[PDB]
Protein backbone atom coordinates (compact mmCIF):
# COMPACT_ATOMS: atom_id res chain seq x y z
CA UNK A 1 0.00 0.00 0.00
CA UNK A 2 1.25 3.96 -0.36
CA UNK A 3 -0.10 6.44 2.01
CA UNK A 4 -0.06 10.46 1.40
CA UNK A 5 -0.21 12.15 4.65
CA UNK A 6 -1.62 15.86 4.62
CA UNK A 7 -1.79 16.99 7.90
CA UNK A 8 -4.20 19.95 7.01
CA UNK A 9 -6.30 19.45 4.25
CA UNK A 10 -8.87 22.38 3.20
CA UNK A 11 -12.21 22.65 1.37
CA UNK A 12 -11.44 25.39 -0.85
CA UNK A 13 -14.59 27.18 -1.02
CA UNK A 14 -14.45 28.84 -4.88
CA UNK A 15 -17.15 31.46 -5.07
CA UNK A 16 -18.35 33.45 -7.70
CA UNK A 17 -20.49 36.16 -7.14
CA UNK A 18 -22.58 39.00 -8.71
CA UNK A 19 -20.06 41.70 -8.21
CA UNK A 20 -18.19 42.28 -4.75
CA UNK A 21 -19.40 44.72 -2.51
CA UNK A 22 -16.90 45.18 0.79
CA UNK A 23 -19.53 46.41 4.12
CA UNK A 24 -22.42 45.03 1.87
CA UNK A 25 -24.80 42.43 0.81
CA UNK A 26 -23.26 40.23 -1.49
CA UNK A 27 -25.41 37.03 -3.29
CA UNK A 28 -23.07 34.49 -4.80
CA UNK A 29 -24.36 32.97 -7.99
CA UNK A 30 -22.07 29.86 -8.44
CA UNK A 31 -19.93 27.97 -5.61
CA UNK A 32 -17.57 25.10 -5.89
CA UNK A 33 -15.90 22.92 -3.32
CA UNK A 34 -12.76 21.24 -3.83
CA UNK A 35 -10.65 19.12 -1.55
CA UNK A 36 -7.69 20.65 -1.08
CA UNK A 37 -4.40 19.00 0.44
CA UNK A 38 -0.63 18.24 -0.99
CA UNK A 39 -1.23 14.68 -0.01
CA UNK A 40 -4.38 14.52 -1.55
CA UNK A 41 -3.16 16.21 -4.75
CA UNK A 42 -0.36 13.02 -4.71
CA UNK A 43 -3.20 10.76 -4.16
CA UNK A 44 -4.90 12.27 -7.31
CA UNK A 45 -2.05 12.22 -9.96
CA UNK A 46 -1.45 8.55 -8.10
CA UNK A 47 -5.29 7.20 -9.21
CA UNK A 48 -4.74 9.49 -12.50
CA UNK A 49 -1.63 6.99 -12.95
CA UNK A 50 -4.13 3.82 -12.32
CA UNK A 51 -1.89 3.59 -8.73
CA UNK A 52 -3.96 3.19 -5.50
CA UNK A 53 -3.43 5.56 -2.20
CA UNK A 54 -5.18 5.76 0.99
CA UNK A 55 -5.15 9.22 2.42
CA UNK A 56 -4.23 9.67 5.82
CA UNK A 57 -4.03 13.25 8.17
CA UNK A 58 -6.19 14.70 10.08
CA UNK A 59 -10.00 15.45 9.30
CA UNK A 60 -13.26 16.56 11.50
CA UNK A 61 -16.32 18.02 11.45
CA UNK A 62 -18.75 18.16 8.52
CA UNK A 63 -15.70 19.42 6.67
CA UNK A 64 -13.74 16.21 7.00
CA UNK A 65 -16.49 14.49 6.26
CA UNK A 66 -16.90 15.66 2.43
CA UNK A 67 -13.31 15.27 1.95
CA UNK A 68 -13.34 11.81 2.85
CA UNK A 69 -16.45 11.35 0.36
CA UNK A 70 -14.97 13.53 -2.23
CA UNK A 71 -12.01 10.79 -2.28
CA UNK A 72 -14.64 8.15 -2.33
CA UNK A 73 -16.17 9.32 -5.04
CA UNK A 74 -12.74 9.49 -6.59
CA UNK A 75 -12.59 5.41 -5.43
CA UNK A 76 -9.29 7.26 -3.41
CA UNK A 77 -9.88 5.39 0.26
CA UNK A 78 -8.47 6.96 3.34
CA UNK A 79 -8.24 6.51 6.71
CA UNK A 80 -7.91 10.20 8.40
CA UNK A 81 -7.62 10.51 11.85
CA UNK A 82 -10.83 11.77 13.22
CA UNK A 83 -10.09 15.33 15.53
CA UNK A 84 -12.45 17.45 17.84
CA UNK A 85 -12.52 21.17 15.46
CA UNK A 86 -13.47 21.15 12.32
CA UNK A 87 -11.40 20.45 9.20
CA UNK A 88 -10.67 24.30 8.13
CA UNK A 89 -12.66 26.06 4.89
CA UNK A 90 -10.53 28.09 2.81
CA UNK A 91 -12.41 30.81 1.06
CA UNK A 92 -11.49 31.90 -2.86
CA UNK A 93 -13.45 34.70 -4.60
CA UNK A 94 -13.20 34.63 -8.50
CA UNK A 95 -15.80 37.57 -9.48
CA UNK A 96 -13.43 40.72 -10.94
CA UNK A 97 -10.83 40.41 -7.99
CA UNK A 98 -9.40 36.67 -6.87
CA UNK A 99 -9.32 37.01 -3.40
CA UNK A 100 -8.10 34.20 -0.99
CA UNK A 101 -9.14 33.93 3.06
CA UNK A 102 -7.18 31.22 4.53
CA UNK A 103 -8.62 30.07 7.82
CA UNK A 104 -5.94 27.82 10.56
CA UNK A 105 -6.17 24.65 10.53
CA UNK A 106 -8.28 22.60 13.81
CA UNK A 107 -6.80 21.96 16.98
CA UNK A 108 -5.34 18.46 17.20
CA UNK A 109 -4.76 17.00 20.59
CA UNK A 110 -1.17 14.45 21.19
CA UNK A 111 -3.43 12.14 21.66
CA UNK A 112 -4.63 12.22 17.57
CA UNK A 113 -0.89 13.09 16.18
CA UNK A 114 -0.60 9.91 18.44
CA UNK A 115 -3.22 8.03 16.58
CA UNK A 116 -1.53 8.51 13.20
CA UNK A 117 1.73 7.67 14.23
CA UNK A 118 -0.07 4.14 15.40
CA UNK A 119 -0.74 3.83 11.55
CA UNK A 120 2.92 4.44 10.40
CA UNK A 121 3.96 2.33 13.03
CA UNK A 122 1.87 -0.54 11.12
CA UNK A 123 3.23 0.01 8.09
CA UNK A 124 5.53 -2.95 6.42
CA UNK A 125 8.63 -2.88 4.13
CA UNK A 126 6.33 -2.91 0.87
CA UNK A 127 4.82 0.28 2.02
CA UNK A 128 5.44 3.73 0.93
CA UNK A 129 4.68 6.81 3.38
CA UNK A 130 4.75 10.21 0.86
CA UNK A 131 4.52 12.93 3.74
CA UNK A 132 2.98 16.32 1.93
CA UNK A 133 3.50 19.77 2.95
CA UNK A 134 3.39 22.08 5.74
CA UNK A 135 3.25 21.65 9.19
CA UNK A 136 -0.05 22.65 11.52
CA UNK A 137 0.48 24.85 14.70
CA UNK A 138 -0.84 22.40 16.46
CA UNK A 139 0.72 19.45 15.98
CA UNK A 140 4.60 18.86 17.03
CA UNK A 141 7.22 20.78 14.57
CA UNK A 142 9.19 17.63 13.83
CA UNK A 143 6.31 15.82 12.59
CA UNK A 144 8.00 14.81 9.56
CA UNK A 145 11.38 13.33 10.97
CA UNK A 146 8.97 11.33 13.90
CA UNK A 147 6.79 9.68 10.75
CA UNK A 148 11.01 9.06 9.37
CA UNK A 149 11.71 7.80 12.37
CA UNK A 150 9.10 5.35 12.83
CA UNK A 151 10.13 4.07 8.88
CA UNK A 152 12.98 3.61 9.62
CA UNK A 153 11.67 1.01 12.00
CA UNK A 154 9.16 -0.44 10.07
CA UNK A 155 11.00 -1.14 6.48
CA UNK A 156 8.63 1.09 4.87
CA UNK A 157 9.56 3.57 2.10
CA UNK A 158 9.92 7.22 3.10
CA UNK A 159 9.15 10.06 0.47
CA UNK A 160 9.00 13.71 1.45
CA UNK A 161 7.29 16.09 -0.42
CA UNK A 162 8.17 19.47 1.35
CA UNK A 163 10.85 22.29 1.25
CA UNK A 164 14.48 22.01 2.41
CA UNK A 165 14.46 21.84 5.97
CA UNK A 166 11.93 19.26 6.47
CA UNK A 167 13.84 16.94 3.86
CA UNK A 168 16.63 17.55 5.65
CA UNK A 169 15.46 16.48 9.24
CA UNK A 170 14.87 13.29 7.51
CA UNK A 171 17.82 12.43 5.86
CA UNK A 172 19.19 10.36 9.06
CA UNK A 173 16.13 8.19 8.52
CA UNK A 174 17.24 7.08 4.97
CA UNK A 175 14.19 8.23 2.93
CA UNK A 176 13.76 6.69 -0.49
CA UNK A 177 13.98 10.38 -1.79
CA UNK A 178 13.92 13.93 -1.37
CA UNK A 179 13.20 16.55 -3.79
CA UNK A 180 14.93 19.51 -3.41
CA UNK A 181 15.80 22.33 -6.48
CA UNK A 182 18.72 23.54 -7.67
CA UNK A 183 18.40 26.66 -5.68
CA UNK A 184 18.08 25.06 -2.30
CA UNK A 185 21.11 22.95 -3.07
CA UNK A 186 22.81 26.39 -3.45
CA UNK A 187 21.84 27.36 0.54
CA UNK A 188 22.27 24.15 1.85
CA UNK A 189 26.34 23.96 0.77
CA UNK A 190 27.10 27.30 0.18
CA UNK A 191 27.67 27.16 -3.17
CA UNK A 192 26.77 27.98 -6.67
CA UNK A 193 25.53 25.52 -8.44
CA UNK A 194 25.77 25.65 -11.98
CA UNK A 195 26.09 22.62 -14.04
CA UNK A 196 24.91 19.40 -14.26
CA UNK A 197 28.34 17.84 -12.42
CA UNK A 198 27.60 20.49 -9.89
CA UNK A 199 23.91 18.95 -9.34
CA UNK A 200 25.04 15.40 -9.00
CA UNK A 201 27.83 16.32 -6.54
CA UNK A 202 25.75 18.09 -4.07
CA UNK A 203 22.86 15.52 -4.80
CA UNK A 204 25.02 12.66 -3.64
CA UNK A 205 26.46 14.36 -0.67
CA UNK A 206 23.05 14.63 0.34
CA UNK A 207 22.93 10.84 -0.56
CA UNK A 208 25.83 10.48 1.75
CA UNK A 209 23.86 12.43 4.42
CA UNK A 210 20.93 9.82 4.48
CA UNK A 211 18.76 9.70 1.61
CA UNK A 212 19.08 6.68 -0.72
CA UNK A 213 17.73 9.01 -3.56
CA UNK A 214 17.35 12.84 -4.49
CA UNK A 215 15.59 14.24 -7.23
CA UNK A 216 16.75 17.79 -7.77
CA UNK A 217 13.82 19.97 -9.71
CA UNK A 218 15.73 22.52 -11.94
CA UNK A 219 11.96 24.27 -13.51
CA UNK A 220 11.48 24.27 -17.21
CA UNK A 221 15.17 23.45 -17.37
CA UNK A 222 14.07 19.55 -16.08
CA UNK A 223 15.60 17.49 -13.77
CA UNK A 224 17.93 15.59 -11.82
CA UNK A 225 18.18 12.31 -10.36
CA UNK A 226 20.75 11.26 -8.12
CA UNK A 227 21.54 7.78 -6.64
CA UNK A 228 24.70 6.36 -4.76
CA UNK A 229 25.41 4.42 -8.44
CA UNK A 230 23.78 6.35 -10.84
CA UNK A 231 22.59 10.41 -12.20
CA UNK A 232 19.96 10.86 -14.83
CA UNK A 233 18.99 13.88 -16.52
CA UNK A 234 15.42 14.70 -17.79
CA UNK A 235 14.92 17.32 -20.46
CA UNK A 236 10.99 18.35 -20.70
CA UNK A 237 9.51 19.49 -23.81
CA UNK A 238 8.60 23.63 -23.67
CA UNK A 239 5.53 24.81 -23.61
CA UNK A 240 3.24 27.49 -22.37
CA UNK A 241 3.06 27.24 -18.66
CA UNK A 242 -0.62 27.64 -17.51
CA UNK A 243 -0.31 26.75 -13.52
CA UNK A 244 2.92 25.03 -11.82
CA UNK A 245 0.44 24.78 -8.49
CA UNK A 246 0.73 20.71 -7.99
CA UNK A 247 3.99 20.02 -10.54
CA UNK A 248 6.07 19.32 -7.15
CA UNK A 249 3.12 16.73 -6.17
CA UNK A 250 3.06 15.58 -9.47
CA UNK A 251 6.34 14.95 -10.01
CA UNK A 252 6.42 13.25 -6.64
CA UNK A 253 3.38 10.37 -7.72
CA UNK A 254 4.61 10.09 -10.70
CA UNK A 255 8.03 8.93 -9.25
CA UNK A 256 6.09 6.52 -6.58
CA UNK A 257 3.55 5.44 -8.99
CA UNK A 258 6.57 4.27 -11.75
CA UNK A 259 8.48 2.69 -8.73
CA UNK A 260 5.00 0.52 -7.60
CA UNK A 261 4.42 -0.44 -10.85
CA UNK A 262 7.68 -1.77 -11.83
CA UNK A 263 9.08 0.72 -13.91
CA UNK A 264 13.22 1.65 -13.94
CA UNK A 265 14.94 3.99 -11.85
CA UNK A 266 15.03 6.29 -15.26
CA UNK A 267 11.31 5.66 -17.17
CA UNK A 268 9.98 6.26 -13.25
CA UNK A 269 12.19 9.73 -13.37
CA UNK A 270 10.56 10.03 -17.00
CA UNK A 271 6.85 9.89 -15.89
CA UNK A 272 7.92 11.81 -12.87
CA UNK A 273 8.98 15.12 -15.04
CA UNK A 274 6.13 14.53 -17.26
CA UNK A 275 4.32 14.65 -14.56
CA UNK A 276 5.47 17.87 -13.01
CA UNK A 277 5.39 19.35 -16.80
CA UNK A 278 2.02 17.82 -17.55
CA UNK A 279 0.55 20.19 -14.39
CA UNK A 280 2.40 23.05 -15.08
CA UNK A 281 0.92 23.19 -18.63
CA UNK A 282 -2.57 22.69 -17.41
CA UNK A 283 -5.20 24.79 -15.47
CA UNK A 284 -5.15 21.87 -12.89
CA UNK A 285 -3.68 18.77 -12.21
CA UNK A 286 -3.16 16.77 -15.32
CA UNK A 287 -5.23 14.07 -17.24
CA UNK A 288 -3.63 10.85 -18.46
CA UNK A 289 -3.11 11.58 -22.02
CA UNK A 290 -1.74 14.62 -21.00
CA UNK A 291 1.08 12.81 -19.04
CA UNK A 292 1.34 10.05 -21.34
CA UNK A 293 1.87 12.63 -24.47
CA UNK A 294 4.75 14.57 -22.60
CA UNK A 295 6.51 11.42 -21.12
CA UNK A 296 7.65 10.56 -24.84
CA UNK A 297 8.75 14.60 -25.50
CA UNK A 298 10.67 13.89 -21.99
CA UNK A 299 14.54 13.06 -22.99
CA UNK A 300 16.51 10.74 -20.59
CA UNK A 301 20.16 10.72 -20.20
CA UNK A 302 22.34 8.62 -18.14
CA UNK A 303 24.89 11.47 -16.49
CA UNK A 304 27.39 8.95 -14.24
CA UNK A 305 27.36 5.47 -13.06
CA UNK A 306 24.94 2.36 -14.15
CA UNK B 1 -46.41 21.10 18.35
CA UNK B 2 -44.61 24.72 16.59
CA UNK B 3 -43.08 23.94 13.44
CA UNK B 4 -40.45 26.46 11.53
CA UNK B 5 -39.94 26.32 8.18
CA UNK B 6 -36.22 27.15 6.27
CA UNK B 7 -36.37 26.53 2.67
CA UNK B 8 -32.57 27.52 2.58
CA UNK B 9 -31.04 27.11 5.83
CA UNK B 10 -27.24 27.89 5.74
CA UNK B 11 -23.97 27.36 7.82
CA UNK B 12 -23.31 30.93 8.76
CA UNK B 13 -19.57 30.50 8.11
CA UNK B 14 -18.39 33.77 10.52
CA UNK B 15 -15.00 34.84 9.34
CA UNK B 16 -12.60 37.45 11.25
CA UNK B 17 -9.98 38.97 9.58
CA UNK B 18 -8.10 42.45 9.88
CA UNK B 19 -7.74 44.85 6.64
CA UNK B 20 -9.39 42.55 4.37
CA UNK B 21 -7.76 42.45 0.85
CA UNK B 22 -9.21 42.27 -2.19
CA UNK B 23 -7.17 40.08 -4.91
CA UNK B 24 -4.76 39.09 -2.15
CA UNK B 25 -4.36 35.80 0.43
CA UNK B 26 -5.96 36.89 3.64
CA UNK B 27 -5.30 34.53 6.91
CA UNK B 28 -8.18 34.44 8.97
CA UNK B 29 -7.60 35.45 12.98
CA UNK B 30 -10.33 33.20 13.52
CA UNK B 31 -13.82 31.97 12.58
CA UNK B 32 -17.11 29.95 13.60
CA UNK B 33 -19.90 28.59 12.28
CA UNK B 34 -23.47 28.48 13.14
CA UNK B 35 -26.81 27.41 11.45
CA UNK B 36 -28.50 30.09 10.02
CA UNK B 37 -31.74 30.50 8.19
CA UNK B 38 -35.28 32.93 9.55
CA UNK B 39 -36.95 29.41 10.43
CA UNK B 40 -33.86 28.01 12.30
CA UNK B 41 -33.94 31.67 14.30
CA UNK B 42 -37.20 31.46 15.16
CA UNK B 43 -36.36 27.70 16.64
CA UNK B 44 -33.51 29.27 18.30
CA UNK B 45 -35.24 32.06 19.95
CA UNK B 46 -38.16 29.78 20.71
CA UNK B 47 -35.58 28.04 22.58
CA UNK B 48 -34.21 30.08 24.33
CA UNK B 49 -37.67 31.40 25.78
CA UNK B 50 -38.24 27.56 26.60
CA UNK B 51 -41.09 26.45 23.24
CA UNK B 52 -40.56 23.60 21.43
CA UNK B 53 -40.50 23.72 17.95
CA UNK B 54 -39.43 21.24 15.24
CA UNK B 55 -37.46 23.00 12.20
CA UNK B 56 -39.30 22.09 8.71
CA UNK B 57 -37.44 22.89 5.44
CA UNK B 58 -34.34 21.53 3.39
CA UNK B 59 -31.03 19.73 4.23
CA UNK B 60 -28.36 17.77 2.28
CA UNK B 61 -25.17 16.67 2.28
CA UNK B 62 -23.10 17.00 5.17
CA UNK B 63 -23.66 20.83 5.68
CA UNK B 64 -27.40 19.34 6.25
CA UNK B 65 -25.96 17.02 8.82
CA UNK B 66 -24.27 20.03 10.46
CA UNK B 67 -26.78 21.76 11.13
CA UNK B 68 -29.12 18.78 12.35
CA UNK B 69 -26.25 18.11 14.76
CA UNK B 70 -25.82 22.11 15.74
CA UNK B 71 -29.86 22.00 16.38
CA UNK B 72 -29.95 18.89 17.98
CA UNK B 73 -26.71 19.82 20.50
CA UNK B 74 -29.20 22.84 21.31
CA UNK B 75 -31.88 20.47 22.19
CA UNK B 76 -34.49 21.35 19.10
CA UNK B 77 -35.93 18.86 16.58
CA UNK B 78 -35.84 18.98 12.95
CA UNK B 79 -37.17 16.98 10.73
CA UNK B 80 -36.01 17.98 7.36
CA UNK B 81 -36.17 16.60 3.76
CA UNK B 82 -33.05 15.12 2.57
CA UNK B 83 -32.24 17.05 -0.50
CA UNK B 84 -29.40 15.53 -2.94
CA UNK B 85 -26.87 19.03 -3.07
CA UNK B 86 -24.98 20.39 -0.38
CA UNK B 87 -27.16 23.01 2.13
CA UNK B 88 -25.45 26.54 1.65
CA UNK B 89 -22.55 28.16 3.31
CA UNK B 90 -22.67 31.92 3.56
CA UNK B 91 -19.86 33.98 4.22
CA UNK B 92 -19.71 36.42 7.01
CA UNK B 93 -16.46 38.62 6.80
CA UNK B 94 -15.93 40.66 10.01
CA UNK B 95 -13.13 43.48 9.75
CA UNK B 96 -13.98 46.72 10.45
CA UNK B 97 -16.80 46.31 7.75
CA UNK B 98 -19.48 43.46 7.89
CA UNK B 99 -19.45 41.80 4.50
CA UNK B 100 -22.24 39.27 4.17
CA UNK B 101 -21.56 36.62 1.19
CA UNK B 102 -24.89 34.67 0.85
CA UNK B 103 -24.87 31.66 -1.56
CA UNK B 104 -27.43 29.75 -3.46
CA UNK B 105 -29.60 26.91 -2.44
CA UNK B 106 -29.16 23.43 -2.78
CA UNK B 107 -31.08 22.28 -6.04
CA UNK B 108 -34.16 20.81 -4.63
CA UNK B 109 -36.63 18.56 -6.82
CA UNK B 110 -40.55 18.66 -7.10
CA UNK B 111 -40.51 14.79 -5.30
CA UNK B 112 -38.73 16.73 -2.29
CA UNK B 113 -41.13 19.81 -2.35
CA UNK B 114 -43.86 17.47 -2.05
CA UNK B 115 -42.22 15.87 0.89
CA UNK B 116 -42.66 19.02 2.69
CA UNK B 117 -46.36 19.80 1.42
CA UNK B 118 -46.93 16.15 3.38
CA UNK B 119 -45.89 17.09 6.53
CA UNK B 120 -47.38 20.29 6.80
CA UNK B 121 -50.66 17.95 5.73
CA UNK B 122 -50.02 15.45 9.02
CA UNK B 123 -50.93 18.98 11.37
CA UNK B 124 -53.95 19.77 13.41
CA UNK B 125 -55.84 22.55 14.47
CA UNK B 126 -53.26 22.67 17.54
CA UNK B 127 -50.59 23.52 15.52
CA UNK B 128 -48.38 26.53 14.50
CA UNK B 129 -46.50 26.95 11.29
CA UNK B 130 -43.62 29.49 10.84
CA UNK B 131 -42.79 29.86 7.74
CA UNK B 132 -40.05 32.37 7.20
CA UNK B 133 -37.46 33.44 4.30
CA UNK B 134 -36.73 33.49 0.39
CA UNK B 135 -37.90 30.67 -1.75
CA UNK B 136 -34.86 29.13 -3.25
CA UNK B 137 -35.38 29.30 -7.47
CA UNK B 138 -35.49 25.75 -7.48
CA UNK B 139 -39.05 24.95 -5.43
CA UNK B 140 -42.10 26.74 -6.76
CA UNK B 141 -42.51 30.34 -6.86
CA UNK B 142 -45.96 30.31 -4.82
CA UNK B 143 -44.56 27.64 -2.21
CA UNK B 144 -45.95 30.31 0.75
CA UNK B 145 -48.97 29.67 -1.00
CA UNK B 146 -48.86 25.60 -1.33
CA UNK B 147 -48.39 25.84 2.27
CA UNK B 148 -50.93 28.72 2.74
CA UNK B 149 -53.43 26.52 1.64
CA UNK B 150 -52.56 23.14 3.07
CA UNK B 151 -52.91 24.50 6.62
CA UNK B 152 -56.31 26.14 5.82
CA UNK B 153 -57.14 22.98 5.86
CA UNK B 154 -55.71 21.07 8.61
CA UNK B 155 -56.62 24.05 10.47
CA UNK B 156 -52.89 25.26 12.26
CA UNK B 157 -52.15 28.48 12.79
CA UNK B 158 -50.09 29.82 9.76
CA UNK B 159 -47.21 32.47 10.30
CA UNK B 160 -45.38 34.10 7.88
CA UNK B 161 -42.21 36.18 7.65
CA UNK B 162 -41.53 37.16 4.02
CA UNK B 163 -40.97 39.51 1.49
CA UNK B 164 -44.12 41.67 0.39
CA UNK B 165 -45.63 39.54 -2.47
CA UNK B 166 -45.00 36.43 -0.81
CA UNK B 167 -46.60 37.97 2.29
CA UNK B 168 -49.61 39.13 0.26
CA UNK B 169 -50.39 35.66 -1.19
CA UNK B 170 -50.93 33.78 1.94
CA UNK B 171 -53.27 36.34 3.14
CA UNK B 172 -56.59 34.33 1.54
CA UNK B 173 -55.24 31.96 3.78
CA UNK B 174 -56.15 33.91 6.79
CA UNK B 175 -52.17 33.63 8.99
CA UNK B 176 -52.14 34.21 12.28
CA UNK B 177 -50.38 37.37 11.56
CA UNK B 178 -47.92 38.72 9.22
CA UNK B 179 -44.84 40.75 9.71
CA UNK B 180 -44.20 43.47 7.07
CA UNK B 181 -42.37 47.04 7.64
CA UNK B 182 -43.34 50.27 7.55
CA UNK B 183 -41.52 50.42 4.01
CA UNK B 184 -43.49 47.48 2.38
CA UNK B 185 -46.70 49.26 3.03
CA UNK B 186 -45.78 51.95 1.49
CA UNK B 187 -44.79 49.77 -1.46
CA UNK B 188 -48.09 47.53 -0.92
CA UNK B 189 -50.59 50.30 -0.69
CA UNK B 190 -48.44 52.73 -2.87
CA UNK B 191 -48.73 55.71 -0.52
CA UNK B 192 -46.67 57.38 2.62
CA UNK B 193 -46.94 55.51 5.73
CA UNK B 194 -46.08 58.91 8.14
CA UNK B 195 -47.38 58.25 11.76
CA UNK B 196 -49.12 55.53 13.78
CA UNK B 197 -52.42 55.94 12.81
CA UNK B 198 -51.20 55.44 9.11
CA UNK B 199 -50.14 52.22 10.38
CA UNK B 200 -53.19 50.95 11.70
CA UNK B 201 -55.11 52.35 9.12
CA UNK B 202 -53.15 49.93 6.20
CA UNK B 203 -52.31 47.34 8.59
CA UNK B 204 -56.12 46.74 9.39
CA UNK B 205 -56.89 46.50 5.46
CA UNK B 206 -54.30 43.70 5.37
CA UNK B 207 -56.41 42.16 8.43
CA UNK B 208 -59.52 42.95 5.65
CA UNK B 209 -57.87 40.61 2.86
CA UNK B 210 -57.18 38.47 5.22
CA UNK B 211 -54.44 38.35 7.98
CA UNK B 212 -55.88 37.63 11.43
CA UNK B 213 -53.45 40.24 13.10
CA UNK B 214 -50.39 42.07 11.65
CA UNK B 215 -47.12 43.48 13.22
CA UNK B 216 -45.35 46.47 11.67
CA UNK B 217 -42.02 46.83 12.49
CA UNK B 218 -40.73 50.15 12.73
CA UNK B 219 -37.05 49.47 13.57
CA UNK B 220 -35.53 51.24 16.40
CA UNK B 221 -39.18 53.10 16.72
CA UNK B 222 -40.84 50.02 17.68
CA UNK B 223 -43.70 47.87 16.03
CA UNK B 224 -47.50 48.17 15.86
CA UNK B 225 -49.78 45.37 16.00
CA UNK B 226 -53.08 45.33 14.19
CA UNK B 227 -56.23 43.14 15.08
CA UNK B 228 -59.98 43.83 13.57
CA UNK B 229 -60.58 44.90 17.50
CA UNK B 230 -57.71 46.62 18.84
CA UNK B 231 -54.09 48.40 17.45
CA UNK B 232 -51.25 48.32 19.29
CA UNK B 233 -48.13 50.44 19.93
CA UNK B 234 -44.84 49.14 21.00
CA UNK B 235 -41.82 51.40 22.28
CA UNK B 236 -38.48 49.87 22.63
CA UNK B 237 -35.63 51.07 24.98
CA UNK B 238 -33.12 53.02 22.91
CA UNK B 239 -29.42 51.76 22.61
CA UNK B 240 -26.26 50.77 20.53
CA UNK B 241 -27.54 48.63 17.97
CA UNK B 242 -24.94 46.08 17.54
CA UNK B 243 -26.42 43.48 15.16
CA UNK B 244 -29.97 43.61 13.61
CA UNK B 245 -29.22 40.26 12.02
CA UNK B 246 -32.09 37.74 13.57
CA UNK B 247 -34.20 40.19 15.22
CA UNK B 248 -37.27 40.30 12.68
CA UNK B 249 -36.78 36.54 13.49
CA UNK B 250 -36.52 36.87 17.10
CA UNK B 251 -39.53 39.21 17.13
CA UNK B 252 -41.45 36.48 15.03
CA UNK B 253 -40.81 33.90 17.81
CA UNK B 254 -41.53 36.35 21.25
CA UNK B 255 -44.75 36.40 19.47
CA UNK B 256 -45.49 33.13 18.92
CA UNK B 257 -43.89 32.02 22.32
CA UNK B 258 -46.08 34.51 24.41
CA UNK B 259 -49.29 33.12 22.49
CA UNK B 260 -47.94 29.39 22.68
CA UNK B 261 -47.26 29.90 26.57
CA UNK B 262 -50.63 31.83 27.52
CA UNK B 263 -49.88 35.35 27.13
CA UNK B 264 -52.03 38.23 26.34
CA UNK B 265 -52.14 39.13 22.58
CA UNK B 266 -50.53 42.64 24.29
CA UNK B 267 -47.58 40.86 26.72
CA UNK B 268 -47.20 38.15 23.96
CA UNK B 269 -46.59 41.09 21.43
CA UNK B 270 -44.26 43.21 24.47
CA UNK B 271 -42.32 39.73 24.51
CA UNK B 272 -42.02 39.94 20.56
CA UNK B 273 -40.64 43.25 20.83
CA UNK B 274 -38.45 42.76 23.87
CA UNK B 275 -36.83 39.88 21.62
CA UNK B 276 -36.06 41.66 18.00
CA UNK B 277 -34.63 44.74 20.25
CA UNK B 278 -32.70 42.64 22.45
CA UNK B 279 -31.04 40.67 19.57
CA UNK B 280 -30.66 43.99 17.61
CA UNK B 281 -28.42 44.74 20.65
CA UNK B 282 -26.08 42.12 20.80
CA UNK B 283 -23.59 39.81 18.80
CA UNK B 284 -26.27 37.18 17.43
CA UNK B 285 -29.34 35.91 18.98
CA UNK B 286 -30.62 37.48 22.61
CA UNK B 287 -30.22 35.49 26.14
CA UNK B 288 -32.80 34.75 27.75
CA UNK B 289 -32.04 37.61 30.64
CA UNK B 290 -31.47 40.07 27.79
CA UNK B 291 -34.88 39.35 26.67
CA UNK B 292 -36.68 39.79 30.14
CA UNK B 293 -34.68 42.89 30.97
CA UNK B 294 -35.84 44.71 28.11
CA UNK B 295 -39.38 43.63 28.23
CA UNK B 296 -39.75 45.59 31.62
CA UNK B 297 -38.52 48.44 29.26
CA UNK B 298 -41.00 47.97 26.40
CA UNK B 299 -43.78 50.11 26.85
CA UNK B 300 -47.10 49.04 25.70
CA UNK B 301 -50.27 51.17 24.57
CA UNK B 302 -53.67 50.62 23.18
CA UNK B 303 -54.02 52.94 20.17
CA UNK B 304 -57.54 51.82 19.32
CA UNK B 305 -60.44 49.64 19.91
CA UNK B 306 -60.85 47.58 23.11
Redesign the interface.
Known sequence: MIYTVTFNPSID?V?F?ND????????????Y?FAGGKGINVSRVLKTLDVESTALGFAG???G??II?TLNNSAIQSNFIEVDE?TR?N?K?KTG????????GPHITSTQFEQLLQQIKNTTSEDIVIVAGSVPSSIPSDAYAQIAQITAQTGAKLVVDAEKELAESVLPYHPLFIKPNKDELEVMFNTTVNSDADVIKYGRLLVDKGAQSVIVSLGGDGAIYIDKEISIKAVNPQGKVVNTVGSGDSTVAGMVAGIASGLSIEKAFQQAVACGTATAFDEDLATRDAIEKIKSQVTISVLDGE
Not at 97 to 104: F, K, L, M, S
Open positions: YITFKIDGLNRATATKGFPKFDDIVLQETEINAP
